Amino acid sequence: SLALSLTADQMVSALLDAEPPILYSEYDPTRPFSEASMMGLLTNLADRELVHMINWAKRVPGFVDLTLHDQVHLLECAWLEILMIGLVWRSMEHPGKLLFAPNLLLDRNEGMVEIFDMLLATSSRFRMMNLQGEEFVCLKSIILLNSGVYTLKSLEEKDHIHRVLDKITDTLIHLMAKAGLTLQQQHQRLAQLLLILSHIRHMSNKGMEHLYSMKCKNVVPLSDLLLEMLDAHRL
């Protein structure tokens, strides 16, 4: 693999160039919205983001080295996690608000509000740490590779994922050392970043519950792709 041959700077450059764009929603301030229609907007937005995410994943160093079935599994496991850390990243500069889209900035106003507050808290954590763009793309790639690494010779695939994950770890430290952090500060910041991933996992799990609670209630037309991504978490 060429992913294991990349320097930390090359790794960063690769991830930065693979970044998906920020998409617009169908939000219209002159148009009235219910909770049902607002979920419709987000569903539509997430569906279009998924297509970009899939092509982003293919440009994550080491990802296409895997079998298609393993590629499918990782994305099935991580898609809402990746959407959420993207949402949180976009919302850093907007305290108390979530920037779902450049034209969709929502503040806190069922347990949907709880998930909302959880996202706000994570965003608050990002800005207090002064999370960098180079760090963010590393974090996002880690989520993709790690979230499903533990759901014959399938172990060879699992080994490769671990080695790439080690590479991203090396890359994170490299970025922090370049930022002038002491060794103690590097280890502490590394831990801080990775602990956030546990929180992102939690929000994703809670998010899937609500989306499944949604789907069953007719309430909102889920897209064909979202239905399949969602169904993977039901088994």
Partner: peptide, 9 residues
């Protein structure tokens, strides 16, 4: 399977 299709492309 949609995801498998888009990945295989």
């Amino acid at each position: 399977k949609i995801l498998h299709r888009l990945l295989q492309d």
